[PDB]
Design an enzyme around this catalytic site. Structure first.
Site, PDB file in Angstrom:
ATOM      1  N   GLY B  45       0.727  -1.248   0.033  1.00 50.03           N
ATOM      2  CA  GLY B  45       0.045   0.210   0.056  1.00 50.03           C
ATOM      3  C   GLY B  45       0.833   1.367  -0.020  1.00 50.03           C
ATOM      4  O   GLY B  45       1.936   1.324   0.393  1.00 50.03           O
ATOM      5  N   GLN B  50       3.028  10.074   1.070  1.00 52.96           N
ATOM      6  CA  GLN B  50       4.348   9.406   1.003  1.00 52.96           C
ATOM      7  C   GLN B  50       5.024   9.725  -0.254  1.00 52.96           C
ATOM      8  O   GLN B  50       6.463   9.697  -0.409  1.00 52.96           O
ATOM      9  CB  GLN B  50       3.985   7.710   1.011  1.00 52.96           C
ATOM     10  N   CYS B 102       6.439  -0.041   6.542  1.00 55.25           N
ATOM     11  CA  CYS B 102       5.910   1.131   6.001  1.00 55.25           C
ATOM     12  C   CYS B 102       7.189   1.715   4.937  1.00 55.25           C
ATOM     13  O   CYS B 102       8.282   1.670   5.460  1.00 55.25           O
ATOM     14  CB  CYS B 102       5.495   2.330   6.927  1.00 55.25           C
ATOM     15  N   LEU B 103       6.902   1.780   3.948  1.00 54.81           N
ATOM     16  CA  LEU B 103       7.827   2.315   2.902  1.00 54.81           C
ATOM     17  C   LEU B 103       8.341   3.559   3.159  1.00 54.81           C
ATOM     18  O   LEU B 103       9.598   4.081   2.670  1.00 54.81           O
ATOM     19  CB  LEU B 103       7.268   2.506   1.570  1.00 54.81           C
ATOM     20  N   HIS B 144      -3.888   1.182   7.845  1.00 55.35           N
ATOM     21  CA  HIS B 144      -2.436   1.542   8.010  1.00 55.35           C
ATOM     22  C   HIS B 144      -2.368   2.934   6.835  1.00 55.35           C
ATOM     23  O   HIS B 144      -1.872   4.130   7.158  1.00 55.35           O
ATOM     24  CB  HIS B 144      -1.658   0.745   7.327  1.00 55.35           C
ATOM     25  N   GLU B 145      -3.082   2.877   5.883  1.00 56.35           N
ATOM     26  CA  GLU B 145      -3.035   3.918   4.551  1.00 56.35           C
ATOM     27  C   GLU B 145      -3.656   5.013   4.783  1.00 56.35           C
ATOM     28  O   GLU B 145      -3.444   6.222   4.806  1.00 56.35           O
ATOM     29  CB  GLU B 145      -3.131   3.201   3.253  1.00 56.35           C
ATOM     30  N   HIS B 148      -2.066   7.348   6.988  1.00 54.25           N
ATOM     31  CA  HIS B 148      -1.194   8.469   6.439  1.00 54.25           C
ATOM     32  C   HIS B 148      -2.077   9.753   6.118  1.00 54.25           C
ATOM     33  O   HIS B 148      -1.375  10.750   6.165  1.00 54.25           O
ATOM     34  CB  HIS B 148      -0.654   7.933   5.188  1.00 54.25           C
TER      35      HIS B 148
HETATM   36 ZN   LIG Z   1       2.834   3.485   5.599  1.00 56.50          ZN
END
Ligand SMILES: [Zn+2]
Ligand SMILES: [Cl-]
Ligand SMILES: [Cl-]
Ligand SMILES: [Zn+2]
Lengths: 179, 179
Positions: B45, B50, B102-103, B144-145, B148
């Site tokens: 995701g 991000q 997480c990226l 999670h997304e 953000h």
């Molecule tokens: Zn993330």
């Protein structure tokens, strides 16, 4: 201190509000002003963006109906409430149509469908973690105010035709006030 | 096109993302780039923030647990998903503890407690109204997304020692070491 209220179509009302890092003296003073401002304008709710500050803070006071059931733990009315950093943790599938107004759209009222019940976690005036379980008008006011924090006024749910008439009615009142 | 990923402690990851007013070609282009950037970095995701854009847009692909009940009619995996203006319309009270990455926090993983299932209304790639009823890892990723979009990375739920350890791991991992 009674603050000035941002009204549509002011674009500040369309921007999302930021999370409060900590509930300190300066947040409390803002919350005092917001509440004084709400009571002065005879409102049931008020988000900080409505006084020009983009922080996730709202206050509410929903009086009991002058009377001519609840789920255990839930409330239909009450306040004053100070709700900082609200997080939705449960929301009803049942929806209800109610008439809404707003101090940022003065002189315009319309019917909006939203969930009947909602549970919300938040930080209170003291910086403590709380949960409010809300039905009826308390749930109504709370969701309306949470919308403000996300940059949404209740006109969003109406057709473009009604929304534009609403915005033009707010301005024509302000322009007529200047004749 | 593969974009650079904003990484902690970059202050942009803490700001809330705005509603998308119209899903036009500029939005689809950003989504295309987000998919390519997600595929290229081995991610499940990715939120627009991000990649440096503060708009309520996320993408997911979860390809094919006795800690969760498998509920009829909820998706456990799938994609690719383009989810714009996500609105949470239902959320489980049962929760589960799962490992997340997480990226924007490369090299660090930890256990986070979140609701097991979520229902989310959204606009898709063509601007059509849709609904997703997610469970298992699909719901974990989706939640999670959505975090953000609201200025929250998963380090928020960890103790401060772990949050700052993770952030230091990133600051050190971003230096390719001169041997
Ligand atoms: Zn993330
Ligand atoms: Cl909270
Ligand atoms: Cl939507
Ligand atoms: Zn309002």
């Amino acid at each position: 201190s009674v603050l000035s209220i941002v009204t549509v179509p002011d674009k500040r009302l369309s921007l999302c509000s930021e999370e409060v890092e900590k509930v300190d003296q300066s947040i409390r003073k803002l919350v005092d002003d917001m509440f004084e401002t709400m009571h002065a304008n005879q409102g049931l709710g008020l988000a900080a963006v409505q006084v020009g500050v983009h922080k996730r803070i709202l206050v509410m006071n929903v009086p009991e109906e002058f009377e001519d059931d609840k789920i255990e733990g839930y409330e239909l009315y009450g306040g004053p409430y100070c709700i900082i950093n609200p997080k939705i943790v449960d929301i009803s599938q049942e929806k209800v149509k109610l008439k809404e107004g707003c101090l940022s759209v003065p002189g315009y009222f319309d019917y909006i469908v939203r969930p009947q019940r909602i549970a919300v976690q938040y930080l209170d005036y003291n910086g403590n973690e709380c949960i409010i379980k809300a039905q009826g008008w308390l749930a109504r006011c709370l969701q309306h105010e949470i919308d403000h924090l996300n940059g949404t006024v209740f006109l969003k749910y109406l057709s473009k035709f009604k929304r534009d008439f609403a915005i033009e009615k707010v301005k024509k009142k302000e322009r007529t006030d200047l004749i």
